[PDB]
C-alpha cells in the first residue's frame, strides 16, 4: 500500500 | 528550488545535443534560445554545493558570472542563426560547451541514481517471489494434502489467498518506478490499485480474526468446541471477503490513468472535491486497516495473560498451562511485526499530505519504497511463518 | 511429542535462573530420555542426560552448550534462514534475468552490435541470464532437501552452471585484454578491435567451453542419500581423485589465471598512462579504472566460496549447523552477483540510460 | 558454482  | 535548477542545467544540456544534430536554421534557433531562458533561470538559483552561501559570497558571484559569459555566447551564435548561418552557428555551440565546463560545471556535480533503482528493484522482486510463490506454495499443501476440515486450515488459507494477491501487484509497482510511466493502460490500472487495497483489508481482517480465534482457543477451551467449527471459520472469512468489497470496487470505479508530463499515471480521481476525499480515504484506511486490528489483537493479548495469570495464581499445574503460555507471547510477536511493518508507511502517507518532501532526494526514494515494501512483508510473512510452523501443516508438506 | 519434549527442557532452565533447581533437573531428565526416543541426535541426549546427572549431584549453563548438538537436528530460527535465502537467491536471479536480457534488448534492438566493445558485452549478457536461469532450482533443492526435478533437468543444470561460469569469466578476461590492446597498443587496436575480430573471439569462447559443459553433461547423475535425492557428479574410479583434479582446475584456470591476466593488464595501462608526457588523454584513464574495480569485484565476489570449496573438502564441515549453511548459500549468491550484474553491466547501462539516472547532488 |  503507497502506489503511488 | 533545486528541481528548477536540474531541470534548466537538463534544458541546457539537452538542447546543446539538438543543435549538434540539427539541419536548419530554424532548429538551431530555438534550441539556444531555450538554452538562453534556461541559462538566465538557472542563474538565479543557489547550488547545493554553495547553500550555506550569501547570494552576494565570491563564489555565488562566480557561479552567475558563467552564466553571463554563456548567454552573451548564445546571442553571438542566435545572430549567426538569424543571418542565414547555420556552420558557423553549430561551432559557436562548441564553445558554450567549454564555457559550461570551465565556469558552471564545478558547482552543479551531478551522481548516477542506477544503484538505488537496482536495490529497489531487488527489494520488489524478493518480496514478490518470497510472497507470491511461498503463499501459493502454501494454499496448494492446505487444498492437496492438509484437507481444510479444521478452523485453523480455513484461516490459514485466507491470510495465503490475501498475501499472493498483494504481491502480485509489486511486478507493476516496480516497472512504474523504473519506466517513470505507466506502460500497462487504464483497465491493468484499475485491476492493480483495487487489488492493492483490497487485499490490503482481507489480509489484515483474516489475521484479526486469527487473534480472536486463538484467544476464544486459550481463554474458552470447553466453548470453544461449539464456536471453533469449520462451517463457522468458513462463514466468517467468506463475510470478510465480501464485506471488503465496499473498498476494492469504488478503487476500481476511481483508479484511472492520466497524461502528466509527457508520462502516464496511475491514479484514483476522487469526487468533488478531490484533495478532501483524497484525505478522508488516507484517514479511513489508517484507522480501519492499522488502529482498529491493533487495538482487538492487544485487547486478546492482554486478556490473554490475565486469563493466565490467573491460572498461574492458581498453583495447580503449570505442566500443561505453559503450553498456552507460548500462544499468547505468539500474539505478542504478531503484533509487534504488524505495528514495526505498517507504522513507516502509515506515518510516511500523514507526513506526505501535511508537508512538501523533496520527491527527487535518494534518501526519501530509498526510505519510501522500504516502507512500501515492509507491509508486503507483513502481509506474505504471517501466513507462511504460521502455516510452516504448524506441526499438522509440517508433516503434510 | 519431540517438539513438546524440546519446550519442556527449556522452559525449565528458567526456572533455575536449592530444591527447586532439583525438581527441575529432575523434570528435564525424563524430558530429555523421552527426547531421545539419527544415532548423532540420540548421542546428543546421552551427553545431556550425563551432564544434567553430575548437576543432580551439585554444569549451571553447560547444558545449554551440549544442547547445540540437538537444536540442529531454534525452530523459527531455521525457517528465517530459510526464507532469507530464497529472498536472496530469487533477488539474485531477478535482478540477473531482467539485467542481462536488457543489457541483450538494448545491444541488439538500439546499439546494434556495431562496435568490439558491444559483442564482449552481448556475450558477457547472455552468459549472465544462463547463469541466473539455474538458481530457481538450487533454491528449491535447498528448501526441499532434495533434488525433484530428475537426471535429465540435474544434468541441464549442473551443465549450464559449469559452462556458463567459464564463458561469463573468460568474456570478462578477454574484454580487459581488448581494452588493454586499445589503450597500450592503438596502431595495433585498429586491426585487432573491429567487430568481425571480436564475434570470432567471443565464438571461440562459447565453442571452446564445450570441453567442460559436454563433460560435465555426461557426469551429473541423480543419486539417493538417507532416503532423500542428490543432483551431483559421477567422477570415474577414483572419484575422490577426479572430484580434486576438478576441483583445482576451476580454481586454477576459472580464479587465479583470469585475475593474473586482468592484474597484469591493469599494472600495463597504468605504465602507458605514467609514459604520458587533455580530456582524450584522461578518456584513457578511466578504462584503465574501469578494469581495476573488474578485478576487485571479481576477487571479492569469488574468493569466499573457492575459500569454502577448499574447507569443505579438507575439514569436516557440520552441513546441519545454521550459520555455516548460511554463509554457505551467501558465497555461492556472491559469486552469481559477478557472473550476471558485473561491473562492466552496470557501466554499459549508467551510460545509455544516463538520463534516467543523472540527477545532481 | 558449489551446487551442490
Ligand atoms: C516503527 C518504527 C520502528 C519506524 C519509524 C518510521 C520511519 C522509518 C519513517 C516513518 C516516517 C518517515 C519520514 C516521513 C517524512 C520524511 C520527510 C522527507 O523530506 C525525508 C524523509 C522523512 C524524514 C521520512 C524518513 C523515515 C520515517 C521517519
Ligand atoms: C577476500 C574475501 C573476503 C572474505 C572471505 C572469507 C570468508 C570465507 C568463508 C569460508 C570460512 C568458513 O565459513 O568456513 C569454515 C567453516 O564454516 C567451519 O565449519
Ligand atoms: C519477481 C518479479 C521481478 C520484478 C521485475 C520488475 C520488472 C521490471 C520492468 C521493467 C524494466 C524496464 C527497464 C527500462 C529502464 C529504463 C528507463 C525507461 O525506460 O524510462
Ligand atoms: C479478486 C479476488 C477475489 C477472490 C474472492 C475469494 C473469496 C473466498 C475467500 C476466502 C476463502 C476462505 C476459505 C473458506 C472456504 C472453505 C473451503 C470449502 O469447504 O469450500
Ligand atoms: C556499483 C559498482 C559499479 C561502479 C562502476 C561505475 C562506472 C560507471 C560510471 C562512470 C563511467 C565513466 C564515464
Redesign the pocket.
Known sequence: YXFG | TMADLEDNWETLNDNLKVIEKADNAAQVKDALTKMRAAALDAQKATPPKLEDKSPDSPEMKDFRHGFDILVGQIDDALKLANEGKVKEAQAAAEQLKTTRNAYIQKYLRSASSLALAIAI?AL??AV??VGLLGNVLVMFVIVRYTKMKTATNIYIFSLALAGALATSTL?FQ??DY????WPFGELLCKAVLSIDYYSMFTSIFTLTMMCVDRYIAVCHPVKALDFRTPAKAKLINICIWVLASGVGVPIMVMAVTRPRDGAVVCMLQFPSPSWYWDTVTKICVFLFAFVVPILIITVCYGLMLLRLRSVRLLSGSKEKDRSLRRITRMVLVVVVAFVVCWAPIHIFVIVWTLVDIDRRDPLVVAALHLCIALGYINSSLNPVLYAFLDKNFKRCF
Open positions: 528493484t520488489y522482486s514478490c517471489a511486478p516496480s516497472a523504473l519506466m517513470e510511466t
